Design a protein around this motif. Structure first.
Motif: not given
Lengths: 54, 54
Positions: A23-37
């Motif tokens: 059997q097999k394995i998989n992978a997944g994704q993750d993000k975020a954002v940079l902001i400024l004021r």
């Protein structure tokens, strides 16, 4: 950033006259954002010297 | 407390629960052993590798 989600599945009935299967394995994704004021504000001079403080 | 005990469903969306009452301490079981609990084997002309438990 990535990750490996843990394995899952049933076992098999172990017996002669057969063999197993892998059997097999998989992978997944993750993000975020940079902001400024920012902002700014002014003042005066004349009103400062006529009003008693700055 | 646990999140897994059988839960059936009828029509009209009404849930039924079970929640065994054992309180025994206990019934019994014993593990035993096969031979060759762990083995490593690879396929030379291809490229793979595998694990087994049994």
């Amino acid at each position: 950033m990535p990750y490996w989600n843990d394995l899952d599945g049933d076992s098999q009935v172990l017996n002669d006259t057969d063999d197993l299967v892998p059997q097999k394995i998989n992978a997944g994704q993750d993000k975020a954002v940079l902001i400024l004021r920012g902002n700014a504000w002014s003042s005066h001079d004349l009103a400062a010297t006529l009003s008693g403080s700055d | 407390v646990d999140d897994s005990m059988p839960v059936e469903t009828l029509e009209d969306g009404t849930k039924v629960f079970t929640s065994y009452l054992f309180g025994a301490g206990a019934l019994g079981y014993a593990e035993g052993q096969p031979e060759v609990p762990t083995e490593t084997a690879r396929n030379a002309l291809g490229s793979q590798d595998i694990l087994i438990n049994r």
